[PDB]
């Protein structure tokens, strides 16, 4: 796998809906996680943690896995990094997302993320409280 550059695109409301990848706006869906929606418990917290992590970062990178790069809704499927720290792993490690959607061939970081989830669960953090 290899990391590639992207930048945040700031939406009219001040948040990031899309990343600019090879100079095109794209919604990216994080690989291997289920993140609660805003209306669900921990949803506001997951969103706020993501916003701080990506906005504070000097460098955003995306990393496609070995399988499908876009899903059925046209979203890019990747691991997202903020100054070299994976956003997908960080949400899981904080109990702000669960490991999920593990499909054949896009599963490279599965064990790493399950390791993070077990720690968040052992620590009874957030979703696991
Ligand atoms: C994470 C991921 C989601 N998806 C699709 C599966 C779900 O389809 P369905 O909408 O039919 O349930 C949807 C979940 O995304 P969200 O959790 O963003 O809603 O995204 C993929 O196809 N590949 C993936 O790797």
UniProtKB/Swiss-Prot annotation:
Protein name in UniProt: Nuclease A
Comp. bias (Basic and acidic residues): 109-125
Active site as annotated: 29, 37, 75
Compartments it resides in: Secreted
Gene source species: Staphylococcus aureus
Binding site for Ca(2+): 15, 34-35
Start and end residues of each stretch annotated as Disordered: 109-129
TM helices/strands, residue ranges: none
């Amino acid at each position: 796998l290899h990391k590639e550059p992207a930048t945040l695109i700031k939406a009219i409301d001040g948040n990031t809906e899309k990343l600019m990848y090879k100079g095109q706006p794209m919604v990216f869906r994080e690989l291997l996680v289920d993140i609660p929606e805003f209306n669900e418990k921990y949803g506001p917290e997951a969103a706020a943690f993501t916003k701080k992590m990506v906005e504070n970062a000097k460098k955003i990178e995306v990393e496609f896995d070995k399988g499908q790069r876009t899903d059925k809704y046209g979203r890019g499927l990747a691991y997202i990094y903020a100054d070299g720290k994976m956003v997908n792993e960080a949400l899981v490690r904080q109990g702000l997302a669960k490991v999920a959607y593990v499909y054949k061939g896009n599963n490279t970081h599965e064990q790493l993320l399950r390791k993070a989830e077990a720690q968040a669960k052992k620590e009874k953090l957030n979703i696991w409280s």
